[PDB]
Structures are given as C-alpha cells and as structure tokens.
From Swiss-Prot:
Intervals, Extracellular compartment: 35-80, 173-179, 281-294, 640-663, 761, 865-880
Organism: Mus musculus
Presence of keyword Transmembrane helix: yes
Protein's membrane topology: Multi-pass membrane protein
Domain ABC transmembrane type-1: from-to ranges: 18-321, 618-907
Upper lineage: Eukaryota, Metazoa, Chordata, Craniata, Vertebrata
Residues carrying covalently attached carbohydrate according to the record: 51, 55, 58
Transmembrane segments: 12-34, 81-101, 151-172, 180-200, 259-280, 295-316, 619-639, 664-684, 740-760, 762-781, 842-864, 881-902
Protein name: ATP-dependent translocase ABCB1
Superkingdom assignment: Eukaryota
Quaternary structure, from the entry: Interacts with PSMB5.
Binding residues for ATP 2: 977-984
Length: 1182
C-alpha cells in the first residue's frame, strides 16, 4: 500500500521496462554460477585426461591422441562458453543499469514537479508550522535518496538473489551434504566477528575513559593557562600529563593485542573451515568416487553465492531506508490538503468593486493555545475612503489586514468584500483585487523590469514607466545604470531601503487593485525617505479603497476615519478631531508619542623523518609482515598443487599427495599466520602506542612553554587545542599503521607473485597482465566518470534548487499569487536540463557497467583459451593455470588494502602537518639567565616611565599611552580608572605578560625588560576577581610550589590563619585534606578568595597585586576579606585596582588613570581637595 506502490507509482511504460530490467537482473545473477558450472565441466574432462596422463609409463602417442582430442573438444566447448555468457552478461548488464536511470529519471522528475507544486499549494500552512527551510532542506535531500532506492540497487538486488537462490538450487541438486558443512561454518564465522564487536566497543570506552583524564588535565590547564603561568606550575602539569598518557597507552596496546588475536583467529576459522570443506570434499572422491571436484569447487561458489546475500543487504537497506522516509513525508510531500485556498474555480465577481466589511470576527493565530489576538470585531469602511487602525502591544491591527487577504479563515464571524462573503469568491481573483504593501519590502533576484513583471505577467515598459513615474520611483532608477534591466545582486540588499519599498508600491500599482493594504509601510525607515515614499502612497491612495495600519501618526492625520485597538481589542472609531474630543485611547498614544581547523601547508615526507627519529627500533615487526606477506601466496600455491596433481595425476598415490598437502595448507597458514599476525600486532601496535605519548608530550610542553598571543589573545579556543591533541596523534597513529600494511601486501604480491609469475611460459604472464591492469584502469576510469557525473549533476540542480530555495523562503509570493505557477514554470525549464542529463547518463552508466563485466568474460576467456589451445597444443600442464588464479587474488588484496589505507594516509598527512608546525613553536621564555637575583633586590619600589601598551590586536586603539607611576616599598598604591582596562593591564604588564610597545618599567631600578622572567614571577601577590581553584586538596591548593617549595603544613597553617579561611579549616571532615568537590561546587566565592589570598601570602611576596578582589562579594564576606587584604598588605608593597572606593580610603597613594594617561595623583584628602574624575567617582558612589 502506502509503503510500496506510490514509491514506484505511475510510469505506465516505465513499469513495463521496470519489470524487463528486473527480468534481465535475474538472468545476470543466474549467469555467474552457470559460468562456474562450466568451470566444473571443463575440470571434469581435463581431470579424466590427467588420470590417464600420469597413468602411462608405457604408452606415449596414445596420450597424444585421446587426451588432446578431449582437450580439443573442450576447446570447442571453451569457445561457445565465454562468448555465450559474455555476450549475455554484456547485453543484460546494459539493460539492468537502464533500470537505475530510465526508470528513476521519469519518476523523480515526476516527483519533483508535484512536490515543488504541492509546496506552494499548501499556502498558509507553511507559515503556520514546521521549519520552512530546514524542512525543505531535508526533503529535497530525501528525494535525492529515492534515486538510490528505485535504481539498479534493486536490479543488483534481484541479481544477488539469483546468485543466491539460483546458486543454492544447483548445489542441493548435485548434493545435499556439503551444504550442511558450509551452513555449519556460517555461525562460526559470525561468532568470530562477534568477538570483534565485543572487543572494539569495550576497549574503545576504556581508552576514552583513559584519555578523558589526559583530556581533563589539558582541559583545565589550557583554560587556566594564565593562572599556571604566573605561578610557574608548568612542570607539575608537565609530569601529570605524562602519567595519564602512561595509562592511556597501556589500554591502547592491550586493545591491539586482543584485536590481532581476533583477526588472526578470524582468518583461522575461515581457512580451517575452508580446509575442512576439502578434506570431507576429497574423501568422497578417492575412496568413494562421486564428485570429480566439480561441485567441490562449485560449492565454494555457493560461498560466492552466499557473499552475494551480503551484497544484497545494502540494496534492500538502500531501498527500505529510502521507502520509509519518503512515504511517511510523502503524505505531506504530495497531494493538496489545502482546503483554505486551493487554486481553482470558486466565484468570479465581475462587479469590479466592493465596500470592505468586517462583521463580528473572532480569530486566533494558529499557534493553538495562544490566546485570541482578536476577540470580536466590528469595522465597516465605506468605498473610496481611507480607514486608519492603531495599536500599542503589537499586532491585532495587522491581523485585520491578514484576514482580509483570506490568509486565515476566521474562527467565528465573517469578512465581507463588497456585500458578499470572501469565502465564496475565487482566491486567485481576490489576491488580484488586493494590493499589499508590507513594512519590510522584498525584491526577487531579477531585473527591476522583472520585479514589476512579477506583479503582472503581461505588461509593457510603458506601464512600468508610468508606474514608477506615478510612484516617483523614476528618479533613482534612471541615474542608476542598466536602467530597468538592472539586476538586484546578492539577494535584496544592494540599494537604499526607501527605494525598495517605493518599487514594491509601483509593483502593486501595476496590479491596479481596487483594494490597497498598507501595513506599517512607513515604519522602520529613515525620516527623509519616509516622506518621499509616503507621497507615492498618497498618490496611490484616494483613487482606491484602502486600509492602512502604521505607528506613524503623521500619515494618520489626513485619514477619513481612525480606529483604536492596542492589542486587537476594538474600542473607538471616527475622525481625528472627534477622537481628540473623547480624549480616549487614540489621544493617549498621540501625546505619548508627541569551529574548524587545518591550514593548507603539508608535510612532504618529513613525517617518516620525524617518526623514525622518535621510533628507536622495530625491524622485527615489518620483517614479520614480509614473511607474512610471502606466506599469503603459499596458500594460493598449496591449493593450486592440490587440485593440480588431482587434475593431472593418476589414481595411484592420490591419497598421499592430497593428505600431505592438506596438512600443509593448515600448518603453513593456521600455525604460522596467527603467529606472525599476532607477532607484528604486538610490534606495530606498541609502535603507534609510544608515538601517541611522545607526540602529545612534546606538543603540550611545546604549547605550555609558549604563550605570547597563542594564549593571551588567540583566535583559537580550548576545544580547538584539545582537538589538536586528539586527532593529530590519532591520525599519525594511522599513518604508521598503513606503512606496515602496504609493505606487507607489497611482498605478498610484487615479491612472491613475481617469483610465481617467473615460472610461467612468459606469454601467459603477458596475457594475464594484458588483462588485470586494463580491467583495473577500466575500473578506475569508471570511478572518475561516476563522480564526474555526480558533480555535474549537483551543479545543475543547484541553480534550480537555489531559485527553488529562493521561493519557499519568500512566503510573500502567495499574496500576489501571480507567481504560483510562474515559479513552477521556471522550475520546469530548470528541471528540464537534468532530465535530459538523466537520459544522458542512462547510456553512460549503461555502457560502463556493461564494459566492466565485458572484461569479466574476456578475462575468463583468455585465461582458459590460452590455457587451452596453444598450451593444450604442446605441453599442456597442470601448473601456471591455477597460478593465474593465484596472481588474481594478489591483485585483489593489492587494490583492496592499498586503496583502503590511502585516505588514512591523507588525513594523517594533514594532521601530522599541523602537529609539526605547532611543535616547532617559538619557545621564547623558558629559563635562560638574564640576571643573578641579587640579595639587595627584595625592596619593591615599582617604576613606570613613558609606558605605552596594546594587547595583540593591532588597530585596537591602545589603552596605555604615556603612562608613568611610582610606588615606595611597604605601602599601598591605590588605583582607579573608568572601566575595563588600564586597570587590569597594569597588573598584567607587571607579570610581563606582554612587553610594552615603548617605554620601560623598573622594580629595584633594574630593567624588567632585561630582568629574568621566572624570578620576576617568583614574587607576586596576584589575586583575580574570580579566583580559579585547581581541583585538588585545598592544602595542595593553598600552597602552589613556586620552585622548590614543598607542601608545608605549618606554613599553610599560617596561610589559613592570615586569610581567615581557618574557620572552614577548623571544622568539617578531613580538614585541610578536603577536596574541592568537583571544581569547588561546595564553596562560595568568599571561601575561594580567602584561599587565593592564602596562595599569595604563602609565597611571601614583596609585591602584592589585587585585581578587583572584592568586586564580586557581599555583606560580611566583603569585610572579612578586606580585613585579610589590609593585613595581607602593609607588610609589603601592594596594588589594589578594586572598584570599591569605600575601602580604598586607607591607602598611601591613590592614582586616577585616564585611558593610558595618569591625570591626578596623591593621598585621599589631597585628591579630595581637588576635583575631576576622582571626586566624581566618590560623588557617584554616594
């Protein structure tokens, strides 16, 4: 029902070919096992020939007769085989792909036109609800999904079942046993893959849980970077970041260990079962003699038939996921629920006029539960008049304008155009009788000639000329170049807003409506252009019955009748003077109104260069991959010798050879492959493991040892930094993983295959490589053409989609209604191009897939043709033919594995490129010397001379210009300024966060410029507004080791004693040992600040710095901190920039800073005697 038939709906002749393509899809899938049925027949005769060939040791010439005759007879069959299937698979291929296009093309094009039509046909509803853009985004993405649902995926789907159902048919008939064995190994292979999902999902979360700690440390530190810098607690975070990494690596290696165990075991269970199938497959030959090895090979094709079920599932999933999403929204997509608008019939008034009448109208916006904006209405406007409506709370007047266009059917009451109800008349006609001027004008992207032409389709520039000329829009347009043919570029914002609306009036003027609706047209406009546009409105009035709502009372003065609302409730009506007489609602208002990343530059082999540098030794891992590489062909060699000697060899000794090789297929792989695979995994696993540490290590330390506008004023963010730590190390981990994988398969094919390739007849090789590269390139050129078609298609629908996206986003097209079909008209012509392009790719996709399979039979042809014939002509041998099959599976593991790790190499290369340029750093300040820390330097008299400063934004108008201060030791230097900066910056510059653009700063008289960075930050009393507490024991928080400083209990006691935080320390559990409880969630600001103060006086700085310490606080908290602060200072030099001027009254020197320029300075009473900024600061303090 709704699920399927509509998904496939219509397509009368389409449905017939839809079935034809379907039919062709079956016989395609049927062909592959039939091709393999042939493989057994050629095997059978060739085997009987081989049995007599080894059986001779007597006669020779006899073997030259019959054995070659059968082979010649087989050569006769060979020719009729590949062609019959080849010509078949060639034709049926081109057909089944036409299903993908020819059927899908006409269907989607049919879908598009109705969908694009139904959207505009829902009218009002889209404004009522949903997303109106996000909705139409996904929906057009949904119709894109449909082509995948009705395409050849289905053709492939029937093809798969034909290989499946048709495959098993042949299997059971030629035996019911082996099936059971093969069916038995199915859950086992599903069991091993089950181990995979358990290991991957479980080990991921552990790793995630591990790096979360490593991530969390980087999370707060990089957020706390300015805090840690000042205290120089870097090396501790340095050490910690290594510990979390130490654990995360151990979860990394075990994951790799267990994974390789699974993947190793996974292949074991396959090959064991593969071996198990033959041993029981062989035992039914030697002692039994039922199968000659035809079905034995053919039942393996049932696995190929079984793999097709795996190829079937996506097409169904492609079909199912497309179906459910489409048909459910299809109900919304298609039809026309409509029934408030429609397009058609209705009544056409020829009366060419009508008095507007509103009668007892109760209405509510379709917000449902929202209260009625309009409860009841009575308004009657006579013909030729102009009625004015007004309000306060908003809308409620605008509603009356909205109902008049029948955009919303009123809940109760009626709106009467002329004498008749509005619901009788044809809607299309009504919109044409109603001109509308909205407050916010809109111009479609087109010529000015066209925007008017959208008002009325049939018009000539003379009416256009007269329109704007009467609308006084004829001035700016003429001076403007291109005249009427001028396009409006980049949507509608180009020129002045007043001119846009004026044109909109002219557009509505062409409409020549007998009703004109103006909603706040004058509102939201510059004063000058307002009067200009108004005259046009004035010139558009008086000739037409109209109704106008705006908030400009200047335009309401000349109105014939005014009506008050204020929220939509009708109260007063009449002429202006009559209204002012009432001094009512009208009169009241009158007097009242009087995150992405990755810069371009690359690595260029520097990857393995830096990698090998950090990779001390691993030659056993890759060597283990090589011996594993060459191990792969041995299987292809062993199996080749099994059936080889089985095909060519006599009845004696058959048991031993097969027995000996059977065991050989096991031990060479099962014993060895598991070992080497787990052996390499333990190597390259740990290889990538330690790299993740050193890299993230040498980065975060390279990040922390550099600040300098990467931290202080970056364009980056915390998340972006963490992202770098995550992806880069993860990607380069993949970079190295791809290295061993390729080199492994390299020798697997190039190294060993060539050795095998060397023993051919040298022509067979050439013929083989006259196929494989050709079919590969043939497979490559298809992929290019495929995306080439995908890209060119997206561009075409884009232009159609944009102009489509243009319309739905503009809901005002429905008020004119002139453009309803007109837009869908352009879309038809726009949609017409991909249609022919859809027809074009039918031939293109048709010939490609056909050709791809055309090389398939041609491959088997030349394989067996030249394997027979000339080789059958002289010295027909069992070898070199199965070795061809060996060379094939190497080409399969080459393309498959290489192309898989190719993009892995890409994103890694890019991610590595970032991590390399970042780690280069610009270390700047770390240690050096620059000073000897003299014992006479304790002191503390801080100098500023000719200091200018700007934070690293160049044209930021620097906050410091010509600034100089001084403070003697052991006394308080007060500071006060307007707001913002120059307050805070001074404290920051003392930290030497940024070296000023000009001037100098001194502490003992020594130059800070030339002073050591560390020791300068060794004595500091820095306290911020909202102190950030690291999550840790408050005891470990109070004391942050400056350099060598151990956690000292007696000291932090003194810290708490002075900071008055000992109250909390006295009581409560664990006392000093209490953790902050997840980022200090159990403590208020007052508690935290006390601790920050304790951090300051732990250091015993000769210089204290208070940045708005009491800025955020209240009540007793303000006094207790001030009590601590005052007691913190007075023993040493201090600077308090706090905005509390009540507590600044005890200060040795108060300084008023005006934006880089110190204005006044002196003791409180001295400045108090003066007047200016400071006295104002106190005067406004009250």
């Amino acid at each position: 029902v709704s699920v399927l038939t509509m998904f496939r709906y219509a397509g009368w002749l389409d449905r017939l070919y839809m079935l034809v393509g379907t039919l062709a899809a079956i016989i395609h899938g049927v062909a592959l096992p039939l091709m393999m049925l042939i493989f057994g027949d050629m095997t059978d005769s060739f085997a009987s020939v081989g049995n007599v060939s080894k059986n001779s040791t007597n006669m020779s010439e006899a073997d030259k007769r019959a054995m070659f005759a059968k082979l010649e007879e087989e050569m006769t069959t060979y020719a009729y085989y590949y062609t019959g299937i080849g010509a078949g698979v060639l034709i049926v291929a081109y057909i089944q792909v036409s299903f993908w296009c020819l059927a899908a093309g006409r269907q989607i094009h049919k879908i598009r036109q109705k969908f694009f039509h139904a959207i505009m046909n829902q009218e009002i509803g889209w404004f009522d609800v949903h997303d109106v853009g996000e909705l139409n985004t996904r929906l057009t993405d949904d119709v894109s999904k449909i082509n995948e649902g009705i395409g050849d995926k289905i053709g492939m789907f029937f093809q798969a079942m034909a290989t499946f159902f048709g495959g098993f048919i042949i299997g059971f008939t030629r035996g019911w046993k082996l099936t059971l064995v093969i069916l038995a190994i199915s859950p086992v292979l599903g069991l091993s893959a089950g181990i995979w999902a358990k290991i991957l999902s479980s080990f991921t979360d552990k790793e995630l849980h591990a790096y979360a700690k490593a991530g969390a440390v980087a999370e707060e530190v990089l957020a706390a970077i300015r805090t840690v810098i000042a205290f120089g607690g870097q090396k501790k975070e340095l050490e910690r970041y290594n510990n979390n990494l130490e654990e995360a690596k151990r979860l990394g290696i075990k994951k790799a260990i267990t994974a390789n165990i699974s993947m190793g075991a996974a292949f074991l269970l396959i090959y064991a079962s593969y071996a198990l199938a033959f041993w029981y497959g062989t035992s039914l030959v030697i002692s039994k003699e039922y199968s000659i090895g035809q079905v034995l090979t053919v039942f393996f094709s049932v696995l190929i038939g079984a793999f097709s079920v795996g190829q079937a599932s996506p097409n169904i999933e492609a079909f199912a996921n497309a179906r459910g999403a489409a048909y459910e929204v299809f109900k919304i997509i298609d039809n026309k629920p409509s029934i408030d608008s429609f397009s058609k019939s209705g009544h056409k008034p020829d009366n060419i006029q009508g008095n507007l009448e509103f009668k007892n109208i109760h209405f509510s916006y379709p917000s449902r539960k929202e209260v009625q904006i309009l409860k009841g209405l009575n308004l009657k406007v006579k013909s030729g008049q102009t009625v004015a409506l007004v309000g306060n709370s908003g809308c409620g007047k605008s509603t009356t304008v909205q109902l008049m266009q029948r955009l919303y059917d009123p809940l109760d009451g009626m709106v009467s155009i002329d004498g008749q109800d509005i619901r009788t008349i044809n809607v299309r006609y009504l919109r044409e009788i109603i001109g509308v001027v909205s407050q916010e004008p809109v111009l479609f992207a087109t010529t000015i000639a066209e925007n008017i032409r959208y008002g009325r389709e049939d018009v000539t520039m003379d009416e256009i000329e007269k329109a704007v000329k009467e609308a006084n829009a004829y001035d700016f347009i003429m001076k403007l170049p291109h005249q009427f043919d001028t396009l409006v570029g980049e949507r509608g914002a180009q020129l002045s807003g007043g001119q846009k609306q004026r044109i909109a009036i002219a557009r509505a003027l062409v409409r020549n409506p007998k009703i004109l609706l103006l909603d706040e047209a004058t509102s939201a406009l510059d004063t000058e252009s307002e009067a200009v546009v108004q005259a046009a409105l004035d010139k558009a009035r008086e000739g037409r019955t109209t109704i106008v709502i705006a908030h400009r009372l200047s335009t309401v003065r000349n109105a014939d009748v005014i009506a008050g609302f204020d929220g939509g409730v009708i109260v007063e009506q009449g002429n202006h003077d009559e209204l002012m007489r009432e001094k009512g609602i009208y009169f009241k208002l009158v007097m009242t109104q009087t995150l992405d990343e990755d810069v371009p530059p690359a690595s260029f082999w520097r990857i393995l260069k830096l990698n090998s540098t950090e990779w001390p030794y691993f030659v056993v891992g890759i060597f283990c991959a090589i011996i594993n590489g060459g191990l792969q062909p041995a299987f292809s060699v062993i199996f080749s010798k099994v059936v080889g000697v089985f095909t060519n060899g006599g009845p004696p000794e058959t048991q031993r050879q097969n027995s000996n090789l059977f065991s050989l297929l096991f031990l060479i792989l099962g014993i060895i492959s598991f070992i080497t695979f787990f052996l390499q995994g333990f190597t390259f696993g740990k290889a990538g493991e330690i790299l993740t540490k050193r890299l993230r290590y040498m980065v975060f330390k390279s990040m922390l040892r550099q600040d300098v506008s990467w931290f202080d004023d970056p364009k980056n963010t915390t998340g972006a930094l963490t992202t770098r730590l995550a992806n880069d190390a993860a990607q380069v981990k993949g970079a190295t993983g791809s290295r061993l994988a390729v080199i492994f398969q390299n020798i697997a094919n190039l190294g060993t295959g060539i050795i095998i390739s060397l023993i051919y007849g040298w022509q067979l090789t050439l013929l083989l490589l006259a196929i494989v590269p050709i079919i590969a390139i043939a497979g490559v050129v298809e992929m290019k053409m495929l995306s080439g078609q995908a890209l060119k298609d997206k561009k075409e629908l884009e232009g159609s989609g944009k102009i489509a996206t243009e319309a739905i986003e503009n809901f005002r097209t429905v008020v004119s209604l002139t453009r309803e079909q007109k837009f869908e008209t352009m879309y038809a012509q726009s949609l017409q191009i991909p249609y022919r392009n859809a027809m074009k790719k039918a031939h293109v996709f048709g010939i490609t897939f056909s050709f791809t399979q055309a090389m398939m039979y041609f491959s088997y042809a030349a394989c067996f043709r030249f394997g027979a014939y000339l080789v059958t002509q002289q010295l027909m041998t069992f070898e070199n033919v199965l070795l061809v099959f060996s060379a094939i599976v190497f080409g399969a593991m080459a393309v498959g594995q290489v192309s898989s790790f190719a993009p892995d190499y890409a994103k890694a290369t890019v991610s590595a490129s970032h991590i390399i340029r970042i780690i280069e750093k610009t270390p700047e300040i770390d240690s050096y010397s620059t000073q000897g820390l003299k014992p006479n330097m304790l002191e503390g008299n801080v100098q500023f001379s000719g200091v200018v400063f700007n934070y690293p934004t160049r044209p930021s108008i620097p906050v410091l210009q010509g600034l100089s201060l001084e403070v003697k030791k052991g006394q308080t230097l007060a500071l006060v300024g307007s707001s913002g900066c120059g307050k805070s910056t001074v404290v920051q510059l003392l930290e030497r966060f940024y070296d000023p653009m000009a001037g100098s700063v001194f502490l003992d008289g020594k130059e800070i410029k030339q002073l050591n960075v560390q020791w300068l930050r060794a004595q500091l009393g820095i306290v911020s507004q909202e102190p950030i507490l690291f999550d840790c024991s408050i005891a470990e928080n109070i004391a942050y080791g400056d350099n060598s400083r151990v956690v000292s209990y007696e000291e932090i006691v003194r810290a708490a004693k002075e900071a008055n935080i000992h109250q909390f320390i006295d009581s409560l559990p664990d006392k000093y040992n209490t953790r902050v409880g997840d980022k200090g969630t159990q403590l208020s600001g007052g508690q935290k600040q006390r601790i920050a103060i304790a951090r300051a006086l732990v250091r015993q700085p000769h210089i204290l710095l208070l940045d708005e310490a009491t800025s955020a606080l209240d009540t007793e908290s303000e006094k207790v901190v001030q009590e601590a602060l005052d007691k913190a200072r007075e023993g040493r030099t201090c600077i308090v920039i706090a905005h509390r001027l009540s507590t600044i009254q005890n200060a040795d020197l108060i300084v008023v800073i005006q934006n880089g320029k110190v204005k006044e300075h002196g003791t409180h009473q001295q400045l108090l005697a003066q007047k200016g900024i400071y006295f104002s600061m106190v005067s406004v303090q009250a």
